Paper text:
Certain bacterial species from genera such as Paracoccus, Pseudomonas, and Alcaligenes have evolved to use DMF as a sole carbon and nitrogen source for growth via degradation by a dimethylformamidase (DMFase). We show that DMFase from Paracoccus sp. strain DMF is a halophilic and thermostable enzyme comprising a multimeric complex of the α2β2 or (α2β2)2 type. The active site consists of a mononuclear iron coordinated by two Tyr side‐chain phenolates and one carboxylate from Glu. The Fe3+ ion in the active site catalyzes the hydrolytic cleavage of the amide bond in DMF.
When the purified native or recombinant parDMFase was imaged on ice by electron cryo‐microscopy (cryoEM), the micrographs unambiguously revealed two populations: a smaller molecule measuring approximately 100 Å diameter and a larger structure of approximately 150 Å in diameter could be identified. Subsequent 2D classification showed that the smaller unit was a dimer, and the larger structure was a dimer of dimers. The dimer of dimers (called tetramer here) has a total mass of 400 kDa. We noted that the salt concentration in the buffer shifts the oligomer (dimer/tetramer) equilibrium. In the presence of low salt, the enzyme is predominantly in the dimeric form, and this equilibrium shifted to the tetramer at higher salt concentrations (≥200 mm). Subsequently, we collected two data sets with no salt and 200 mm NaCl yielding reconstructions with an overall resolution of 3 Å (dimer) and 2.8 Å (tetramer), respectively. The local resolution plot of both maps showed that much of the reconstruction was resolved between 2.5–3.5 Å. The high quality of the maps allowed de novo tracing of polypeptide chains of both the large and small subunits. We used the dimer map for the initial tracing, and the final model is shown in Figure 2 B. The model from the dimer was used to obtain the tetramer model. The mononuclear Fe atom is tetra‐coordinated with the protein. It is coordinated to two phenolates of tyrosine residues (Y399 and Y440 serve as monodentate ligands), and a glutamic acid carboxylate side chain (E521 serves as a bidentate ligand).
Numbering used by the authors:
A (entry chain A), B (entry chain C): 1 to 762
C (entry chain E): 156 to 310
D (entry chain D), E (entry chain B): 8 to 131
Write the structure that this text describes.
Amino acid sequence: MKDIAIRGYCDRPSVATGETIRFYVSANETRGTFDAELVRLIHGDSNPAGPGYKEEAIKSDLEGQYPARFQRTQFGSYVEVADPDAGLQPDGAFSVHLFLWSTTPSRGRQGIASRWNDERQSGWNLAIEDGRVVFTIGDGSGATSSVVSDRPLFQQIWYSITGVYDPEKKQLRLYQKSVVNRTNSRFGLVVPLDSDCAVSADATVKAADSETSLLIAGLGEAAAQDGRTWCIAHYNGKVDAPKIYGCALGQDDAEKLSRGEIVRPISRLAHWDFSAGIGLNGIPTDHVVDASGYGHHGRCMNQPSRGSTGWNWDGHEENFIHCPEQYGALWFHEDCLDDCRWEKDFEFTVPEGLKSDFYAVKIRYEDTEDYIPFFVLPPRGTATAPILVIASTLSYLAYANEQIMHKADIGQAVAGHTPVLNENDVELHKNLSYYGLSTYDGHIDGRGVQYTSWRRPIMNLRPKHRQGFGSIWELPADLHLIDWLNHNGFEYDVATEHDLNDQGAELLRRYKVVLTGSHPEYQTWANADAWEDYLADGGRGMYLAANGMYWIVEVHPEKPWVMEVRKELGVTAWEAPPGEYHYSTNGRRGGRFRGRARATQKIWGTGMSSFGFDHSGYFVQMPDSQDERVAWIMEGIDPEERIGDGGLVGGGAGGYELDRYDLALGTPPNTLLLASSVEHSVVYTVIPDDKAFPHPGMNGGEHPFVRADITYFSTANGGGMFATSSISWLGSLSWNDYDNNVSKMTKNVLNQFIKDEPAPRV
Amino acid sequence: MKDIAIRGYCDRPSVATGETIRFYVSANETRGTFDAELVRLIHGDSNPAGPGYKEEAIKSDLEGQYPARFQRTQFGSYVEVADPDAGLQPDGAFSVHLFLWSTTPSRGRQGIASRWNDERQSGWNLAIEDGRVVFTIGDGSGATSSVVSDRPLFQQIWYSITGVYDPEKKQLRLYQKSVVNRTNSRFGLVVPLDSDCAVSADATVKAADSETSLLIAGLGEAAAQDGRTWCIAHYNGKVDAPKIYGCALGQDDAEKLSRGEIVRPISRLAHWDFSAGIGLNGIPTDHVVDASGYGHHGRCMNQPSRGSTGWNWDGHEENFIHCPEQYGALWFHEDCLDDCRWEKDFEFTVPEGLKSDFYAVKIRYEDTEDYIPFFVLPPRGTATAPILVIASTLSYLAYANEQIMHKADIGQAVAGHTPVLNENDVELHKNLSYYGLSTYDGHIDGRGVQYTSWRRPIMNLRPKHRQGFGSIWELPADLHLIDWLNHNGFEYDVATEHDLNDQGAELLRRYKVVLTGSHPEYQTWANADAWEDYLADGGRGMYLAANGMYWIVEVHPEKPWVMEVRKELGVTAWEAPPGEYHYSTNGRRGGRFRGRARATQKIWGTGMSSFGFDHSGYFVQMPDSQDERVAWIMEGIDPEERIGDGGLVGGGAGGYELDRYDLALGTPPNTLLLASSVEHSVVYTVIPDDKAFPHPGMNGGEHPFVRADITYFSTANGGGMFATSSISWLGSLSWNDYDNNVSKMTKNVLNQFIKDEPAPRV
Amino acid sequence: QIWYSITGVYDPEKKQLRLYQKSVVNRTNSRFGLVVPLDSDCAVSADATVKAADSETSLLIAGLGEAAAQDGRTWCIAHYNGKVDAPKIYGCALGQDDAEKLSRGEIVRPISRLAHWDFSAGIGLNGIPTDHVVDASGYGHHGRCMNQPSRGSTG
Amino acid sequence: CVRDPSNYRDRSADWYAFYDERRRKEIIDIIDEHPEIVEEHAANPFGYRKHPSPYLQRVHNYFRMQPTFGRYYIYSEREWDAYRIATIREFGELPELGDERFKTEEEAMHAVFLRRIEDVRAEL
Amino acid sequence: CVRDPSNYRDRSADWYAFYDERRRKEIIDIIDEHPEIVEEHAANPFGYRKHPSPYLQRVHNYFRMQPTFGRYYIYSEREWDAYRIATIREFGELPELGDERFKTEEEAMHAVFLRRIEDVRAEL
Ligand SMILES: [Fe+3]
Ligand SMILES: [Fe+3]
């Protein structure tokens, strides 16, 4: 069909004046040129019942023609130990020990530990071939020598594997031993497992210098060109404590290494401890320490999961910062990606007279037309507007390259209909290697994706994209608010949640009112602190969304383009495995905000109540609508009207996500309840956070928790928070050509908050 | 109507031969006598479709007439500081400071801290009256002097409260100050809270020796008779760091005390640190340490919740053993009971030739008949039979004095019918002070009950009790199995789960086969270790039940009759507050076994899948039933028949709790799936642990997880494990006068497991 | 032997070399303490007439490069004496607000860093027995100790 | 300034009254549009081997989740001989029993069902 | 003695087959006993302001929770102008598109519903 022929991304989400942003572009093949120009995004939704797509051209130094070329992506987690001087290719006898835990032991050939060239079969490796651990040496002639284990591995069982090369006997040996205990494996000690072997073979050849790096969980593709080794046969599952010896080990040495004893410490050529670097702040680094004392330090590539349960993990401690000796594993999936690592094609330095708004680079290739969005800040330390719009870039990363309808069996069940998918949803399915996975997707192992990255082509971030749950989801849903603010005469600035994480409440206090996106679901702990500190002293805000502070996020300290989330039972897609709840960026718990005594009620007045994606409802006015203290809100609205019966997103104003009033979760006591939503269906459900025992009938129309709630409270020093508690509020702003109750209410509150008089103090 | 006139408990659940059990009986009023005699429990269910009630009298030295009397029960949590020398009634100036966190601040008069006599109004106290903190002294002539706060207390807000008595100005003073932070209280920092006040009043009287003990969270009733002080005006909510001074404090000093600074350390008279004693194994003690060097050590009474979040808790650490300085609180519910502390009426020493079985002491008062069930063991180190029946006494404590149908609003919705309730539930509803609460109950605060005790009259432990979900629930549901074993020729011993906790796998290895109860839901960690050590080495077991290893329990070491469970999301009645998931008896996580990588599939083959209580289903055979390796199980059973269509519990053999085969949770690889249950209704639901997103249709007959699964696997050394995966299995053994498929299958597996040959090795 | 926080800024938009100096003494880190009324804070600027070029040397902490690197080896001539803590290079121009936040140890603008060498990255329970200096910005610009500087020094 | 907690109340009660009014009107409309669910529940009130209709189940889903102050239940006066309908009161009180006795608990369940329909009609 | 993992398998598939058989028979019995739910779905496949019947919702609850390999969806060939019906394949594979084109997406949803009913009738 209309296939995607050009891809691209930018290196950073937001850029102030006088700063450089770099744009990395890739084509299907190296031919032709492509065009590029700068646009200002105004509206994104191409629904014929609305305004249609809107953009504006901007003259810049950025535009021109550039050569189109294919750029290759490395895809899959591994550890790369750079060995320039062939020290880890030993000249005589050498032994390799490691602990293993395989999740897909029959998914092709999977290299475990290797200094191995695979173009010419030179070096040594340790790999899984047809479910069996194989230890192979070679010398580049094509002639190799292997030893194959008698016992095929089981899935998710800890094994202790030793490979031995011995020239004195001209012999390859292999030791295998399962080290199951009560908690570390898939099944426990009641199973009479027999997976111990000790096999030998005749090494007719000698191992040669492979001219590659050493790789944990992979094999090297060819000889290194310009110092880069390419990884090919990716392993899935935990590796714990690998080490290389300069001698040949016996069976008593293998038996002692299976119990965790370090035998012959003077003979270790290398020993990588994956738990070295854990303090009370976690392990926020890609650095892998050589514990032998020879400086063969490694580097984690494409972010394998650190702080993972080891081979000796009994469950007496479930926090990896208090028992680092039982957390020496790294998970290593084959479909991870933290950086595409492409070569830059062009870059942009922001001029002085460039307004702070949403921007995109429009790349015009042969028939494919691609966008690359970015965000432009005001000059550093200054504000150029009274209104601040927060772009929800952390939630853009959470839903980045989302593949629910192609992967999740409950995709159509959460929706209330069959999904409608673009060619972008076909392009993600056809080329998974170019893009990666979302945090709502899982790996090929089964565990969900914790880490997501900005430095990759994110295809559901383009403004002409329409998502599968309904109409539109993340950035075109914020272009609704942008188009409403441009149709009226409001002057605004744009910040991101990464900028909020960097700058604190000092960013927010430059503005009289701060607005959120349509779905600001993922926040850091410092963003919640900044919002609370802003509102506690005269700050005003509008929360024009639902599901607004649900999951705790930490931005990675060494790599600020990578986001971490670990999830638990709640409104979730996956659940974290039992001892692995704590983040590795900071050493803290970080599940739901509500489970850390920081529910969304304690800051924004309302918080997560229900979800469902068939259609939307409308709001019905509560008795606080006729209160004299909120006559400024309900100003041009008859007291018997439906608020928001019609809209682009879902067909109404109350829908897709609902937040409610709750004093026990932390609503301020002076909050008024202006309206509440009705006409919700069986597809909407009560969230698992609110259930004790699941009984029948906890769904829309049949349970009191299924509602959205328009609220308002006031804070000290003339501040106040307004909330509408629905995603599809912003999709109802441009209904009936901007002549509706939704835009009247939002405009009344926004004209009140941009004044100099205090917020009206309910 | 029919009121209960006589009660009773025993000191310990299980007693071996040559050992002593004490009995504690209370009548409604002191008049007359009562009779007592020993019986053997055989069958408890009085359903006319079944065998009817059965028992057997035993001649013993226990029987006779005993004087009836009313025994008063102290009910509610408090800390008691014994002061015979009146050291904590000072003669001159004194001040009191504490941190306050009140859950029901407008519920009666609640004594916070006191050394107070309430008959004659003597001493001093600090109490909540009319929602306001009042500090009152009194001389013992009816004349009191008070000082009342200007600001009422908000609900679940942390306060810093100083009460000062200054004789130099003849002035009672009081200081109140809220100490909220981002995480410790009900609402957060955006609320412009104004509950700070400094008030004063004239003091006309002097405080006198109240001749009571000092009490945290309560007032003393009268003068101490025989050394025992009674507590009347019980507080609800957290108290943190109480201290008494020998001087008069100013507003500067109270302001420094609100920041946690210990002002004037030489002037302290007492200072109780509620976090003194937290090691790496929790705080398993009632001793409260005086941190002022004066030896005024305290004592917890009726088990207040140790390990509670304190006034300065920010959620960076959520385990009290790693940050003990932010966990200095106790919760102090007004409806806790760890021991009724009655007087012994009669005792019993188990004779030399008494069989190990279920026993009870039948008490025969005027028109009322109460039983006191206990358990008789074989002699220490010997086993008198090849069968061990485990009585599920931990699960009996969990459901002890269950009041779901009177308190929980969703109690009928979890069932599928209107509950039928006896006079015992009416007696629990009428006299709450005598009996206590279950762990499926919440407190009056709303937070669920974490501690349950054996030394109290447990009314649903009696065999003639019928329960609200259906027919019968815990001990008559095990009398089903006892009646089936006595009807056939099988010879068994009886042990409890407390004995299994004490004795390990050394208890289990004296037997050929061990049988579980009908619902062995609450287990300790060591019991799961004992079962895994028994099955891993030649042991045989039958799991004639479901929901069998769900929650982690710890028995209190200093008080072996008290059980602890803290709960999370899942199949729960309540969830623990955000910083308090770790037990106080040992400092370990311990919620669901499934979240600790110790699911029920790893040991017993099947694990918790579904629940619902309207009626039961029948089983349909699977293609492993026609296998030649398990033809001994399906011996006299036609391969076209239903298994268990009809029965006393629900009308079928698959019902009320369903367990399934699941390899990912840890089912052994050589497990055969023999049969599965059908005909479940919309009442039966999928558990929250198997849900990612709630969608419509996760109930019986619309989802694959709603099934029971009869399984069998074999272990090493001739062992094996049989599983029926349903509560209502034992209710179907006595159907059609013991002539049905359920009893035939159970008799086949039990005749195989008592032979000397190994298990048939699937 | 007084601890200072030093930011050198090259701003082409104003054609301006800037420099920020600020003493960060506490009760224990320096030669004298907090009773000394120290005044060594300054913010100066100068015009920049030239642009910086590729020196064709390695980067050096505590020294200057002598000539262009011959056979890959860079020689060091103007040797510094004393402690250096947390050196970092940015891709933008910093203000006085940013240098003031950097003096408190806050890592301002983490996405704009070009390199950041953490001299304490690698301390386990067995010391730091290595010459490898870790780039804590994610760009792989890893360092190397030469002639054994004292690792484990007070910061 | 927030200084007195009696000046503040739970404002979700104002929506619970609205929701309960809508929901009672809905349940009496379902009972009037489908009168055979009453005789269906009279035949088999447990749903044993004949599961309830979805409209009967929707009526059950309204009735079973109500707050327990004022909730009907069945009191076993004599087990398998006599059954009475009881009303839940505060802690420390006896239930308010009905005058009519029943033989089987299925008859008591259908009588509770009919009395709940009579109460939800009498409130409108 | 457990030594080779190819000797073992997931024996819950023997019950998933048994469950799918009963479940497909129940779904075609619902569609035969209530023919009006197909026209109910054709009038409004979103249930916008007219929520679906319990029998139509039971048919939806069967169709929507299937495994994704083989599942039907709608491919927006030209948005608001043309819609086709696709079938999900493995990773790396383009989907198999349908022949017929549709104007609105509600027509495509009802054609997916009809084609799923045809495919569940074809296996029996
Ligand atoms: Fe979400
Ligand atoms: Fe239970």
